[PDB]
Write a structure and sequence with these properties.
Chain C: Glycans are attached at residue 2. Chain C: This is Spike protein S1. The structure is cut from a larger assembly and holds three copies of chain A. Chain A has one helix spanning 28-32. With 48 residues, chain A is largely without helices or strands. Chain A is globular, with a radius of gyration of 12 Å. The termini of chain A are far apart. At the A-C interface, helix 1 of A face loops of C.
Amino acid sequence: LCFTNVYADSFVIRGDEVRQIAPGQTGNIADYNYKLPDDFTGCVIAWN
Amino acid sequence: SKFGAISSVLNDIFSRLDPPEAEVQIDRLITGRLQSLQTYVTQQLIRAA
Amino acid sequence: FNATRFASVYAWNRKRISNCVADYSVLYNLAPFFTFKCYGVSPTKLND
């Protein structure tokens, strides 16, 4: 498939908090550091 | 009528659950209510005839 | 948290808590800098 434009965001987080990177999730990270839109499209790649 | 969903209270569905399956529940509610209204309209049309 | 003396590490106390309302925000006033590591739950969402 072809995409109109591509945005890449990179950071480093805690192991337990990796589940907070998802639309509709709540917590410290999902609220005060990084919020994803509910109708989000795209991928998340997280590795130790 | 819950229409097979977990609850019949729409704002409860919003508040108590995250969007992923809350969307499914709301879609089920909307489909059920729309079907009921359609059935009522058709029955009214027959009576009008 | 304000007890005069704590038990020794080997003979550590055990306290049960039930049927109460807890306001953990006050726990942020213990020291100017102190460890608050939390496992399996975000500290900012302990009031919900």
